[PDB]
Amino acid sequence: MIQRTPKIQVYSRHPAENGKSNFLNCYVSGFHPSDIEVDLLKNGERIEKVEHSDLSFSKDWSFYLLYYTEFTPTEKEEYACRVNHVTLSQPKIVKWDRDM
């Protein structure tokens, strides 16, 4: 058996073909087992509609998840990603730095 804690990155991207659009991204990388729970948060509340959830693996024991959706952030709002995994005794919350 092997288990590996996910690395978690939270960042925003504008698709170059539609630059007014903005996407909040949680990239959860290098984890095993693949069982996982991932949410985007707005002011601490789960965002129910997340339009993209893309799972892959490299080696049979290394999984990657890109969890992302369109958003419209204001300077006062706080966004984050919350991850639950067997390796994480408490849910891990990684805040969006709004300059990322």
Numbering used by the authors: 0 to 99
What did the authors write?
Here, we report the use of the TPBLA to explore the role of the protein sequence in determining the aggregation of the naturally amyloidogenic protein, β2m. β2m is 99 residues in length (10.8 kDa) and has a seven-stranded β-sandwich immunoglobulin fold that is stabilized by a single disulphide bond linking Cys25 and Cys80 (31, 32). The protein forms the noncovalently bound light chain of the major histocompatibility complex class 1 (MHC 1) and is important for antigen presentation. Another example is β2m, in which aggregation of the wild-type (WT) protein is associated with the deposition of amyloid fibrils in the joints of patients undergoing long-term renal dialysis (dialysis-related amyloidosis [DRA]).
To examine the structural effect of other amino acid substitutions at this site, the crystal structures of seven variants (D76E-, D76A-, D76S-, D76G-, D76Q-, D76Y-, and D76K-β2m) were determined at high resolution (1.15 to 1.52 Å). In WT-β2m, a salt bridge is formed between the negatively charged residue Asp-76 and the highly conserved Lys41. This interaction is preserved in D76E-β2m and may explain, at least in part, the protection of β2m from aggregation for these two proteins. Indeed, a recent study has highlighted the importance of this salt bridge for D76N-β2m stability and aggregation. A second group of residues, with a significantly reduced score compared to Asp76, includes the D76E- and D76A-β2m variants (∼ 400 AUC [P = 0.01 compared with WT-β2m]), while a third group contains the remaining 17 D76X-β2m variants, which have significantly decreased scores (P = 0.003 compared with D76E/A-β2m).
